[model samples]
Target: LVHVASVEKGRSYEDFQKVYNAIALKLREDDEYDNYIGYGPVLVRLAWHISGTWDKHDNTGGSYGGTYRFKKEFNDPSNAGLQNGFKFLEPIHKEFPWISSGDLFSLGGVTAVQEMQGPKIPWRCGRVDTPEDTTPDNGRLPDADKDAGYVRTFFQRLNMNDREVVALMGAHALGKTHLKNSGYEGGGANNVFTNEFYLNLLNEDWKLEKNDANNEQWDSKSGYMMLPTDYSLIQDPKYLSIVKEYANDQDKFFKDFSKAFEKLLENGITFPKDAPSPFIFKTLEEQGL
Candidate 1:
């Protein structure tokens, strides 16, 4: 089955901008979330998880189907902590009910990144919502307790190369891991998106430790932590080189991350030759608001 991009009836750049502004405004107003870390990180996580279900072989999952709203995907243990992101967008969806679930979810991530001073992710709006039966089964998301080999083989299913995998993982710089949700915890808990995940992975004085979940994770004296999967970047030579490059060059990291993230969100959907170009939304500060 192939999914094709179809613009919402009569919707254009301005319509989506309205949705972006609403999300950005709410992000500012809801500053108390996660002890003031804000909704940015979780929003990014929600977007990734929703889009991450894509299977390159069958093309069944992906953001093309807004199936996360269904109980099955929403109840996915891997998505345990993401209900907060969904609830955050509930009212925004109410105001702009015309948008599809996939579009709202992906746009939330784009808004979160831009509002946090991260790079602009070019977004195209044509992910039509499929039936509840289209929701992919749970466990499609990545595991946190894996090695570099597992990381490399796992991303192959998503069609992500080493650089793309490294770039997407840069998202870890935004949100902290909750042991209850992901079984592994500890890392720099941050709301602002940056290349610091790579920096911390490279520079931290890390020691192996078992957490309350009895899962092994790398702990740093700087009060940060790294999942085995995260530590794998530096453990493997190929991944390490890319990690070093991202850590040392912020501009390169931002550009690579922007392109990779946009592709991640758009996988499994076939866009027409005449589809509209991706939209790069203006941050609130950019609009002089």
Candidate 2:
């Protein structure tokens, strides 16, 4: 849990930037996935799912280990649709064999966010690969069919506050849930990384309905759906206040989200004072894509 930072040997910004460019380029080329939602959403989701396993109480599962590569974590029932993200990264892992799994998985999320025009997330490296024995058990991740209290209590294990929880959930703007995968379906934007999720939550008329999966979800005619946990934001006063703020100011949402995301990825890992500062990479758009 108290992992000391260990920089990859002979690796620095340019090295990771090459990995980022590889991920970004593949994102552009793999345009036919999920009806052209491509790999961005899944990559970010993969990053979060990988990191979400961390328990601040014991420092068991964070991104510090990157043990998701192991069969146990990979086969978690909660990780149903993430195989695509893993498979997508396989070639990149082969190409950059020296980078640790923690770095690659976390970097995949950073690359997907930046390439999709989301806020710049300053990322730090030095997560060495951990052994399979370090992998946490299944069920550490939160369930979707839950209420605000469950949402609040669940994130407490990760040391996230109310604002952080709301800000992080704003990422729902980027991906839809496949019923076959998460037993939830539909979402706004599906690719763009804007505050559209907060906006939709505030403005859309969502009806509670059961999908073919027999799970209750908030459905909107605009082809968006909200997990019970997501809907809990507006339903809970503390979270609702932050949601309103994010809904009203796109810049504020991006700023808050960038910080929360970096924090989420870095949880449970300790960086030495001399560790390299986090890097902010240029987007493919900035590179004239």
Candidate 3:
């Protein structure tokens, strides 16, 4: 059985801030991924996928185990672009030798979200690293080339409702789909982290042109690209309304995203009511500790 870290003995927020600095420092040092975009988005996606596996009914899979760093999880085909995220975190692991892989991986997600100006997710410190056999299979992740009906049905298996599905896709605002990575290319421009994803969905005169080589995802006139599934947001009338709403009010997008992200990270875990309201952790630069 995995042991949860006790609040009494575990390191404080300041110590975790030090770990955050370590990750940031390494992020700066290792700055080459998919044409120098760095490893930010894949890391975010890794955290999302890890936590996304949670099932409300069973409460088995989630970020609590921090299994992604293992060879079994690393080798999963769906995790192709995430090698950089693991490499980026290696130095921090060496620096904080006492920290568990589970804690470090989850903390990396928390750090990235805060640094990117997203919601402040309150995190706990109890995840314990599990064995290799615990690593989940690759196909559990959502397929990029699918449609809204597929997207809805897929997430429902994990117990996500309509609002949660919409909120999660909003995260596509952070990272672009790489041709080499997901067979879909150029969804977001490099490092343009904002609600502009929704905007691009509406404004872009998207041409469904096939790529010269891969011919997987359609290219757009705006120099951005979208998978069939992303474009399906507008194609389907139900998802279209929410997409327009997010495009108009950035605040609404942020609020919905905050709630949804918190839900994503906390899936499959049961917390006590007496458990403190989630603490908003400061990013490394913000803490100045």
* Candidate number of the best lDDT: 1
How much is the lDDT of residue 64 in candidate 1? 94
Candidate 3 clashes: the total is 0
For model 1, the stretches where C-alpha displacement exceeds 4 angstroms are: none
* Residue-wise C-alpha lDDT for candidate 3, range 131-184, written one tens digit per residue: 777766667777777788998888886777776777668777776766676666
List per-prediction Cα lDDT, in the order shown: 0.93, 0.92, 0.71
TM-scores of all predicted structures: 0.98, 0.98, 0.88
Whole-model lDDT, candidate 3? Answer: 0.71
Q: List the residue pairs that clash in candidate 3.
A: none
> Which candidate gets the maximum TM-score versus the true structure?
1
Clashes of each: 1, 0, 0
**TM-score for model 2?**
0.98
- Model 1 per-residue lDDT tens digits across residues 120-214: 99999999999999999998998888899999998998899999999999998887888788887754458888899999998889999999999
Candidate 1 clashing pairs, residues 3+ apart or interchain = 187-225
The worst-scoring run of ten residues by lDDT in candidate 2 lies at 183-192
| C-alpha-based local distance difference test score of model 2 | 0.92
User: Ranking under TM-score, best-scoring first?
Assistant: 1, 2, 3
Per-residue accuracy of model 2 over 53-172 as CA lDDT, tens digit each:
999888899998899999999999999999999999999999999999999999999999888889999999999888999999999999999999999999999999998999999999
